[PDB]
Amino acid sequence: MDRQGFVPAAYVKKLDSGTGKELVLALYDYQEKSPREVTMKKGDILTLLNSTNKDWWKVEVN
């Protein structure tokens, strides 16, 4: 169900920090292209796990 992995940083937008975990908005549909990635749909609100790399951000997809 829930899956975790990397998506291209350009394809998500950070939401302002608030209560709990960091969140991003998925700007585009993105099907995972390699096992280390995950799939997202445009408009998904994703938990942001790691944004330390400029190219690849680790997210949770529910």
UniProtKB/Swiss-Prot annotation:
<feature type="domain" description="SH3">
    <location>
        <begin position="2"/>
        <end position="62"/>
    </location>
</feature>
<comment type="function">
    <text>Morphologically, spectrin-like proteins appear to be related to spectrin, showing a flexible rod-like structure. They can bind actin but seem to differ in their calmodulin-binding activity. In nonerythroid tissues, spectrins, in association with some other proteins, may play an important role in membrane organization.</text>
</comment>
<protein>
    <recommendedName>
        <fullName>Spectrin alpha chain, non-erythrocytic 1</fullName>
    </recommendedName>
</protein>
<comment type="similarity">
    <text>Belongs to the spectrin family.</text>
</comment>
<comment type="subunit">
    <text>Like erythrocyte spectrin, the spectrin-like proteins are capable of forming dimers which can further associate to tetramers. Interacts with ACP1.</text>
</comment>
